[PDB]
Design a protein around this nucleic acid. Sequence first.
RNA 1: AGGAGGUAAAAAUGUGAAAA
RNA 2: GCUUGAGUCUCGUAGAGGGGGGUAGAAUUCCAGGUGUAGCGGUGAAAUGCGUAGAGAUCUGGAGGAAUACCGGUGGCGAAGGCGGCCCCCUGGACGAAGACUGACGCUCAGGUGCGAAAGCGUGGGGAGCAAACAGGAUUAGAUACCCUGGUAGUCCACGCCGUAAACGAUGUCGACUUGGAGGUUGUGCCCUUGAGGCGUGGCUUCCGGAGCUAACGCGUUAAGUCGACCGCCUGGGGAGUA
Lengths: 65, 65, 88, 271, 101, 116
Amino acid sequence: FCRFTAEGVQEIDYKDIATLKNYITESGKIVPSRITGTRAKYQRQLARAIKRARYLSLLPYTDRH
Amino acid sequence: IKVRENEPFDVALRRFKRSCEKAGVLAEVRRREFYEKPTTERKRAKASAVKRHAKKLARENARRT
Amino acid sequence: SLSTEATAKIVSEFGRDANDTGSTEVQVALLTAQINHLQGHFAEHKKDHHSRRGLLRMVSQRRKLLDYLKRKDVARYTQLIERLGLRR
Amino acid sequence: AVVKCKPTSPGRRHVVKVVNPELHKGKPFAPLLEKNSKSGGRNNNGRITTRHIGGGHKQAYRIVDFKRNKDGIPAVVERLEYDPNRSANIALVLYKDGERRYILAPKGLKAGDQIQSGVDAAIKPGNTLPMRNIPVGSTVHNVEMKPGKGGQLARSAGTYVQIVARDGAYVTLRLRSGEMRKVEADCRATLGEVGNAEHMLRVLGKAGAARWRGVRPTVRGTAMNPVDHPHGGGEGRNFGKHPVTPWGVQTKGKKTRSNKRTDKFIVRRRS
Amino acid sequence: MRHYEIVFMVHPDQSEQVPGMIERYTAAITGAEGKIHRLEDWGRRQLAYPINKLHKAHYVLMNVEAPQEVIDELETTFRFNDAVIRSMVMRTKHAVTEASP
Amino acid sequence: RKQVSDGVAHIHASFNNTIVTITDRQGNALGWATAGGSGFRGSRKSTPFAAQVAAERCADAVKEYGIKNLEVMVKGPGPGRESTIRALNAAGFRITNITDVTPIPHNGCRPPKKRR
RNA sequence: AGGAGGUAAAAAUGUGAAAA
RNA sequence: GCUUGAGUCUCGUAGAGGGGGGUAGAAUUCCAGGUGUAGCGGUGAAAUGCGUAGAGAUCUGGAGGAAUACCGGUGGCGAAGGCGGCCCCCUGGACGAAGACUGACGCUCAGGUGCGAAAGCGUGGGGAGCAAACAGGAUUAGAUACCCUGGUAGUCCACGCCGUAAACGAUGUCGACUUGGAGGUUGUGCCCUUGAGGCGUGGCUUCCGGAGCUAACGCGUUAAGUCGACCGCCUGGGGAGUA
């Protein structure tokens, strides 16, 4: 558990993949709230971010091609 | 999924295999999905976790120590 | 979805100004515009019942409104229905 | 559109007429109207080759131009018109130079519309351009087989053809029958689906509706005599034999596709 | 005139002639008052997975402000070229003129 | 026989059988052997040990092809699933890496309703 | 403490009687 | 007449809410081909079935229908039914803040009207997987069932009917009053944000329980508590929700 955008306001996007990799595993599965410790509001804001990298070939759906 | 562990493993040494699915997507969608029992059984399974949490707050009290 | 600027001038057009926005007459107008604008939303799609429940929500409230306006001022109620066009 | 008529009289009961008010009501265009004499299903020898044909209302041959040789010239849709000959609908169009010409009606076509044939056209339905200039995955009609014949495929009411692939000088088409057929990529095709897909819903209601279309009654083969059909004869309508044509050819499962010349173009058979 | 974000991918061959399309697509918006915000061309970067064939497509961002019809003509035009693959858009949310890489 | 060092041992494990095939890097098959080919039947076909007998049998007749190193494509669950890979190492080889391919359906299919 | 891979082929009926 | 009831407007929040149009990946089935041989799939144990034409297995490419892995959470929205990959268009309703104004226009309701899982039915398409009826082989005393191999309707899309469910928090709708603790979720007041905080404030939602209540179980400030309003309904079990 650490700090989030609850006080430090930030508009979330999908480009900062380093921020995305903290919440996705190597197989490319979205990490649930019980491990992120995040509010689901920002997680759903990040869930749409995951599909953008998934669809635009920045991230894979299945890690084995 | 994609393991090397090059030289020193000799068998598998895949704790990640048992941390990605292990039976997850596999053993669950083999057969018998029911479309509605998962909604009810998991709420019942989570209710058993309320009983697992009910143990904790009445614990560490006397217990003949 | 009855945008603000449309609602902005009509209350002043039907009532005293934009600040006298709680009166019956200004309420009759905003419902009618929202009702009429949503006709195209129901001229198409033909199954959008959840939104259609929203459409039917307004006219029921408007039914009490014209009935209340009749009860308050006979001439003014007829002044509005000849100005808007309804009741059949 | 689809309209069922009233049951006021037996013979008016099951009739469903498919009206179209967009069809221009009036006399058709004169110079593009030729006379088509009927034949009654008879040939130069005078015998009847194709049966059950003869009679019906008199029809005038609409001179259509499915060839679509005028390229680059934007054509203006004059009006939609009914055609007695075709299951689909014709559309009088007018090219920019000032020539009137009938073409088929694509599904998405309106009055006063604009289309143009040729290699530099859009992907708007009604345009006609070579298949190598067409994006794969499209939906076309009025397709040729010879580059310059004029167009033989997918010209019925409410039809189309899916373009499957493009391999070099060839284009594989998934035809309406369920057959995949390679054709020359240099051939032309009219974009979209053919207008009047509602023709299928039309039911005739009575026998007179069939006669004034020009189709005579069909006699059941089991009702004939042994000298006239391989079926027939018998007392209690006892069939006993296998289904055949009147000239002794097994029907009900006889693949008589014997061409061998165009056989190299069929990819898959119809199912 | 609402903020959109057209991010698409260009096929390797036409990736060598990509800016003229960018010159053309931005030509569409100046006529309809497109207040462009970013022009983040990453360059022909790597794809995570092969899109039906070989990877490494060219990345172009728009972050455009256009009307609903103008954003429609742009999006539909991308569908008919095999160069531009997988175009998308986004809602406004007052998209800031920052964050390029 | 091409006599190349490379090999790809596709491992198909199932709940009733364990079939292993040693293909090449392209996927061209060279030789295969199964849990059933070693004599095991029914219940005995699906055991972790019988999967090991299969890999001992696939190790036969691949040495004619000069196969030195191999990489495992294991596909599907079952009794062996990891044990038969040790039999590929008990026979002795140069195991470079292992890729475990899993069927990942996103619900596009419908599983059966049997097994009361 | 915290989470899970694995562990039941077959086998019916008793019908009619009384509890200070 | 006035205004706390109710309602309109003002700036924000949230969301699988609804309809239409596109679109992606994996898996699955089919097809062509390379390869490669005697088994393969299945079970409690098998057998049917499939295969020496050459299956299964495996790699290459193409083709379709269907549903959206992880995310996903006693999480949320909706009157309920019910609704979830992604993007766009159209669009309903709810909640929070404090202002301006309307001035009881309120609550509910026989009849009426609309919505309404699945299955089923009508017209026209689709049809991978799955799968009533059904077919075969088994289990068995017998199996018409449970078991396995296949397999049609149907399941899927469009337009329509149908109007019934354990359609169930089994608990009607609306408003007021009446100890708390413990959590999740979404706006927001305010202070030192001087640290994932501190003391409040409303809406929604979860669990344990106080008085009271009840036949008991248990509900227990979203009460089955203390009251008022209107509506619907029950009169022993069947017979029967049938004639």
